[PDB]
Amino acid sequence: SEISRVYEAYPEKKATLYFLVLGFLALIVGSLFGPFQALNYGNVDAYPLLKRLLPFVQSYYQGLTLHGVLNAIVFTQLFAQAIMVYLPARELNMRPNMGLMWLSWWMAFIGLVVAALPLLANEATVLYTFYPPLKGHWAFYLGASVFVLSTWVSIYIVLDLWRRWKAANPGKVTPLVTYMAVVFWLMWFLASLGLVLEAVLFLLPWSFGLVEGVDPLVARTLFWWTGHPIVYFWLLPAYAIIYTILPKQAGGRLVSDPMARLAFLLFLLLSTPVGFHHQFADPGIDPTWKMIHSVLTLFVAVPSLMTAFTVAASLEFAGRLRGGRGLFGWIRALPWDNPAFVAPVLGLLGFIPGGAGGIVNASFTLDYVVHNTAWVPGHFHLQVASLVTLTAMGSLYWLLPNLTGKPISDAQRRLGLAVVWLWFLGMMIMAVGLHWAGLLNVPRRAYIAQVPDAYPHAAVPMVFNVLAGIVLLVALLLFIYGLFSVLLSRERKPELAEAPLPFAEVISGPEDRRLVLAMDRIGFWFAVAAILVVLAYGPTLVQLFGHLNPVPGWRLW
Amino acid sequence: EEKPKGALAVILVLTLTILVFWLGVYAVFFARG
Amino acid sequence: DQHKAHKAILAYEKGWLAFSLAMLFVFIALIAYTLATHTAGVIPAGKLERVDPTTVRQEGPWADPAQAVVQTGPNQYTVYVLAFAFGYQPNPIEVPQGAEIVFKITSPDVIHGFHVEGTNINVEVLPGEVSTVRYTFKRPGEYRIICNQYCGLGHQNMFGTIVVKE
Numbered sequence: 075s076e077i078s079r080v081y082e083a084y085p086e087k088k089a090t091l092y093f094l095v096l097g098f099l100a101l102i103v104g105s106l107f108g109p110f111q112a113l114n115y116g117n118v119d120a121y122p123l124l125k126r127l128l129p130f131v132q133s134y135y136q137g138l139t140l141h142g143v144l145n146a147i148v149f150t151q152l153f154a155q156a157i158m159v160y161l162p163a164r165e166l167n168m169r170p171n172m173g174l175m176w177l178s179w180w181m182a183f184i185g186l187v188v189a190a191l192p193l194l195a196n197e198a199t200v201l202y203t204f205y206p207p208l209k210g211h212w213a214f215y216l217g218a219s220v221f222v223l224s225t226w227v228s229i230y231i232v233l234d235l236w237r238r239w240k241a242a243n244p245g246k247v248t249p250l251v252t253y254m255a256v257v258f259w260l261m262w263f264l265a266s267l268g269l270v271l272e273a274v275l276f277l278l279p280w281s282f283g284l285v286e287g288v289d290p291l292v293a294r295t296l297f298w299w300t301g302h303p304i305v306y307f308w309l310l311p312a313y314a315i316i317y318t319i320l321p322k323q324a325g326g327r328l329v330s331d332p333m334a335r336l337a338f339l340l341f342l343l344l345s346t347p348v349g350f351h352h353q354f355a356d357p358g359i360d361p362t363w364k365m366i367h368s369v370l371t372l373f374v375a376v377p378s379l380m381t382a383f384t385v386a387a388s389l390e391f392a393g394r395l396r397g398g399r400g401l402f403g404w405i406r407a408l409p410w411d412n413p414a415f416v417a418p419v420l421g422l423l424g425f426i427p428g429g430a431g432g433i434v435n436a437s438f439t440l441d442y443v444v445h446n447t448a449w450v451p452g453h454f455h456l457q458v459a460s461l462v463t464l465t466a467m468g469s470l471y472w473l474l475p476n477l478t479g480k481p482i483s484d485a486q487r488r489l490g491l492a493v494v495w496l497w498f499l500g501m502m503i504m505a506v507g508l509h510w511a512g513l514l515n516v517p518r519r520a521y522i523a524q525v526p527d528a529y530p531h532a533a534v535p536m537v538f539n540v541l542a543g544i545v546l547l548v549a550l551l552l553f554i555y556g557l558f559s560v561l562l563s564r565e566r567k568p569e570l571a572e573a574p575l576p577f578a579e580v581i582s583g584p585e586d587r588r589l590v591l592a593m594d595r596i597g598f599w600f601a602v603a604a605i606l607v608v609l610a611y612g613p614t615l616v617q618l619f620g621h622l623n624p625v626p627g628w629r630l631w
Numbered sequence: 632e633e634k635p636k637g638a639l640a641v642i643l644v645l646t647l648t649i650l651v652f653w654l655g656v657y658a659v660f661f662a663r664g
Numbered sequence: 665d666q667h668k669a670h671k672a673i674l675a676y677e678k679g680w681l682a683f684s685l686a687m688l689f690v691f692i693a694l695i696a697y698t699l700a701t702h703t704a705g706v707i708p709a710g711k712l713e714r715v716d717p718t719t720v721r722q723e724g725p726w727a728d729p730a731q732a733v734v735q736t737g738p739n740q741y742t743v744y745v746l747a748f749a750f751g752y753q754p755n756p757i758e759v760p761q762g763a764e765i766v767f768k769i770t771s772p773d774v775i776h777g778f779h780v781e782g783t784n785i786n787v788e789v790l791p792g793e794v795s796t797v798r799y800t801f802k803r804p805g806e807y808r809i810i811c812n813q814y815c816g817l818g819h820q821n822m823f824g825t826i827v828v829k830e
């Protein structure tokens with residue numbers, strides 16, 4: 075059933091743009107629920123308008139559950155399986171198992187479908203974190219469960235066409251994109267353990283019928299095992315594009331490939347053993363395990379601190395190369411007309427307050443000041459809804475023509491670039507209002523608009539959330555209209571469909587071999603990665619699994 | 632060609648931002664203690 | 665230019681790591697300074713403490729709310745608090761200023777938040793376990809209690825009161 079020879083010699087080009095369109099679909103219907111949530115956090119009850127316009131929506135909380143799952147869980151994993159298979163693919167000029175990269179999409183698809191149905195019909199409105207005792211349909215804890223395991227297919231695929239390539243190429247260090255990709259996918263295996271343990275061992279027995287209750291401490295001390303590295307799971311495909319494709323959209327070179335390895339290496343070692351940072355306010359977990367976990371989280375920040383110097387060093391060198399001038403001429407020198415450039419560069423800027431917020435959340439006792447306030451969705455919109463979501467958006471404008479001929483028009487370029495700026499400016503304004511609101515104590519996950527008189531001190535950041543709501547609709551509407559317009563043209567020109575993935579040269583230095591070589595002992599680093607997990611999680615997960623105090627699940631909705 | 636002075640200005644902005652979030656939320660914390 | 669903007673860019677790389685570890689270590693020394701002062705008192709007790717959620721109103725220290733405030737020290741009162749679908753018990757919670765209040769909360773239904781506006785008391789409340797936080801109010805007044813953890817459609821309305829007696 076294939077054809078136009080571009081899609082012939084590379085049919086994973088097809089296996090990519092399917093993932094990359096289910097992932098966008100999910101992002102569309104999720105982000106609809108979004109401006110409705112902003113108006114709320116700006117004391118404006120726009121839910122009459124929603125229940126008329128989507129009479130299937132029951133509660134404020136139904137949509138947040140959709141907002142959560144479709145955006146953070148679903149949009150991101152698929153964009154991750156797109157970029158992080160198809161990249162070690164196009165680099166290596168090899169073909170991923172064409173059969174297995176289809177046990178993925180189907181697998182994910184019906185797994186998505188089997189979760190979509192009970193959510194769509196009020197049966198698992200337990201928010202994107204399903205913390206027991208809240209319980210939902212068997213089909214939810216089945217669907218999202220099948221959906222995540224889809225990734226295990228990805229780990230094999232990629233490890234596989236790595237270990238293939240290795241054999242044909244003895245003595246030759248692993249390629250940059252593939253190296254990225256291999257530590258990435260390994261780290262995620264070691265991390266999916268939790269959300270699968272909790273799914274098999276508790277969520278599925280409990281929800282099918284075979285136990286009457288789950289222990290909340292462990293369901294949650296397990297959920298966060300995964301819950302944390304999964305955001306570094308959503309991050310690194312974007313760090314992929316930024317270290318290896320963005321310096322050339324800029325007119326430059328990735329200045330140090332050893333560093334752009336050391337970062338990924340470091341995410342392999344330290345993304346998983348951290349979850350207590352989400353449990354600072356839980357009982358029945360020791361202050362010293364929280365503390366070892368605090369300090370470790372402050373370390374999962376070093377590779378991003380470094381990511382900052384390397385990416386700036388790089389954009390700046392590109393900028394000087396086009397005649398950029400004094401201390402700041404280089405910003406003005408860059409291609410501020412290519413949304414594939416503008417998109418992830420605006421996201422990187424919003425990332426400076428996001429990471430700062432992160433470094434507070436991590437700081438053990440300081441999480442008491444802002445835990446479960448609006449400060450937290452303030453922090454993570456700057457991280458996943460702005461940086462991560464934006465890179466992707468802007469990577470429809472170089473990754474899309476490179477997957478189905480259809481080129482990008484100067485009508486489309488100028489709508490890709492207005493979309494991107496409004497969604498960035500929207501996000502910043504929501505950052506202020508949400509951070510400021512949390513500091514004034516406004517809770518998170520709350521229909522506060524129904525209690526319009528309870529947070530008088532939040533008067534002025536509430537005006538900010540309203541502005542940010544309007545603006546993200548004007549950007550969500552132009553982006554929907556936009557996303558169809560590109561991949562609903564006839565147009566299919568197959569030439570820029572074989573213009574090879576626009577990677578970057580890589581200012582090679584003498585220091586490269588001792589360093590690179592060291593980090594290429596993948597198998598060994600993977601052994602350190604799963605010993606840190608055993609040192610951090612074991613003494614607790616085991617003085618726990620031998621103290622289980624399970625409890626009836628409740629449906630309050 | 633020299634001092635990547637510009638990249639230095641960006642990690643300086645990052646640094647100042649990390650500092651004022653941290654030190655800001657650090658006082659708020661004692662204020663409520 | 666080009667391979668000498670590699671000589672410079674990887675040594676700055678070296679300087680910036682130095683600086684950043686130095687900075688993250690101050691944050692560890694300062695977090696650690698908080699980790700022993702009265703302000704540290706709000707950290708949930710480490711020890712496990714299991715109870716039966718469905719029997720919890722029908723027997724034990726959280727069963728008749730007038731008994732919630734029980735002195736357990738010369739300058740120390742323990743407040744058994746129970747947090748449930750869409751309210752708190754007792755309400756208000758009366759405690760005197762200057763006193764160590766050991767709060768011991770739990771839930772007969774779903775997980776709840778217990779966040780005392782104006783204070784660092786911010787703690788999760790799990791059905792089947794007892795969170796034990798620990799605080800000393802230095803100003804008399806009323807303090808609102810907010811549930812900051814989603815527990816079904818009652819959530820935005822779930823609030824309590826603590827009066828701290830002049």
Ligand code: HAS
Pocket residue numbers: 305306308309351352371372374375378379381382383385386389405419422423425426428429430432433434435436437441444445446450453454457458462641645
């Ligand atoms: C995609 C997503 C996310 C990233 C990335 C992320 C990063 C961090 N987070 Fe987080 N987070 C926490 C700590 C951190 C820390 C220490 C980091 C670090 O990894 C961040 C490091 C980042 C930096 C150090 C920034 C460097 C800046 C760069 C690299 C850009 C530079 C600009 C350049 C380069 C160019 C400029 C261009 C020119 C033209 C000049 C903690 C606690 O320690 C909590 C629990 C708090 C609570 O009470 O719930 C938490 C809660 C969340 C939740 C809530 C989960 C829930 O629903 O309960 C989400 C969704 C989330 C997402 C994400 N988070 N986080």
Ligand code: HEM
Pocket residue numbers: 105108109110111112115138139141142145146149150201202203451455458459460463518519520521542543546547550
């Ligand atoms: C127009 C765009 C968006 C707007 C206006 C928006 C707004 C909001 C607001 C105000 C909340 C807080 C609601 C509450 O705590 O009651 C929220 C939650 C959330 N958003 Fe967004 N968002 C948008 C896009 C995104 C995107 C793209 C992602 C993608 C990765 C995302 C991930 C999340 C997550 C995980 C939550 C947490 C919900 C929960 O706590 O269960 N959001 N959004």
Ligand SMILES: CCCCCCCCCO[C@@H]1O[C@H](CO)[C@@H](O)[C@H](O)[C@H]1O
Pocket residue numbers: 505506509510513514515659662663782783
């Ligand atoms: C991007 C961030 C925007 C920040 C805007 C300024 C908010 C100032 C925070 O006020 C704090 O609020 C609480 C009042 O209830 C107290 O607990 C605390 O003592 C008080 O000082």
Ligand code: CUA
Pocket residue numbers: 748749750775776777811812813814815816818819820822
């Ligand atoms: Cu109890 Cu929200």
Ligand SMILES: [Cu+]
Pocket residue numbers: 301302303305351352
């Ligand atoms: Cu985390």
